[PDB]
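Q: Predict the assembly, please.
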Amino acid sequence: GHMGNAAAAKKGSEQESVKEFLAKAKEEFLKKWESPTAQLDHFDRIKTLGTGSFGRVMLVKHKETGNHYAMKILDKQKVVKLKQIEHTLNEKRILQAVNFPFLVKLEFSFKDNSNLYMVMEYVPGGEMFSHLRRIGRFSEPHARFYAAQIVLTFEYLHSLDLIYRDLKPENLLIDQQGYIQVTDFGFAKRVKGRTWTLCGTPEYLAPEIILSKGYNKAVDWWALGVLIYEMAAGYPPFFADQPIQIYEKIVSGKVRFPSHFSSDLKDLLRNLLQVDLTKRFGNLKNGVNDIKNHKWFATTDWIAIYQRKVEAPFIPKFKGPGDTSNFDDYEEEEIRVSINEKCGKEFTEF
Amino acid sequence: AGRTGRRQAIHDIL
Ligand SMILES: CNS(=O)(=O)c1cccc2cnccc12
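A: Predicted assembly structure:
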């Protein structure tokens, strides 16, 4: 067969140890899920790091300790108008309960008359998006290093019956050691089987979302295919100026590859960017192992990636704990807090 | 031709 005796036994034992790890991780998650912390004037607001639909993320400095954090600010009225109440509750509840080396850590959460706040660890290396647009494309080994971290992160999340639903370079930060931090749990959800909400980012949507199916966690494996393609090409596989044209390309499923892609990479991508759910990697009997054991990942030491012992391909320049040089500038808007409580009943659980 | 800037999430498809 492909593996000799020693290699097959080593791989089998490794896979059983993953199962043992995941069983413990589920116990820990459920304890936090069942039995889960600051206020605004505890922080100085420094600078906007990024924006989004419901609000913005700001660099803040904690007054007492002097530690820096990234504070996501959501306007309650805007969340209600966009029917994102349950999504925002999901985001905070899930972030509070997970624990994995490549998932951003939530340190505090609170609300006031106008806004919801989530205070997370500040990741100063900037968005993968910026680095990718600046360099053009990542070489295959560089893309593979990041991809491996996503594979492990999705193996963890899916084992907990969590679906992520917004993978893209904009949501992946580079930490001081060159490893990835996944941010933005706005569409994350506990899903045992099917779910139905039409949400995500156009270029990354699986066909079954666009086609209004009751879809499953395999949408995240499709999105991994999009990410790997974009990292290695510099642009995503279904690329057009307007969402409607993007969707038409996705549903056709036709993918063309740059001539510099290796055959191993093309084979992996055809198996992730697979319309037919009975054939998509990550959705078969062998589960995540079809991905982890694929030839494109043959050089990947999965345990060493988890342990953060692989030398990263790129280390951001670090210029102090509150430095923001790896982020773009955004228009600043003062944080207005009404004297009247808004949407109290909708957000009681936050 | 396609989108090179930051891409916003969508909450529905009309
Ligand atoms: C995606 N970039 S961002 O929206 O500015 C952001 C969101 C969530 C956590 C963060 C942590 N450190 C830096 C930026 C962070």
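The first strand of chain A starts at residue 43 and ends at 51. Chain A touches chain B through 28 residues (CB under 8 Å).
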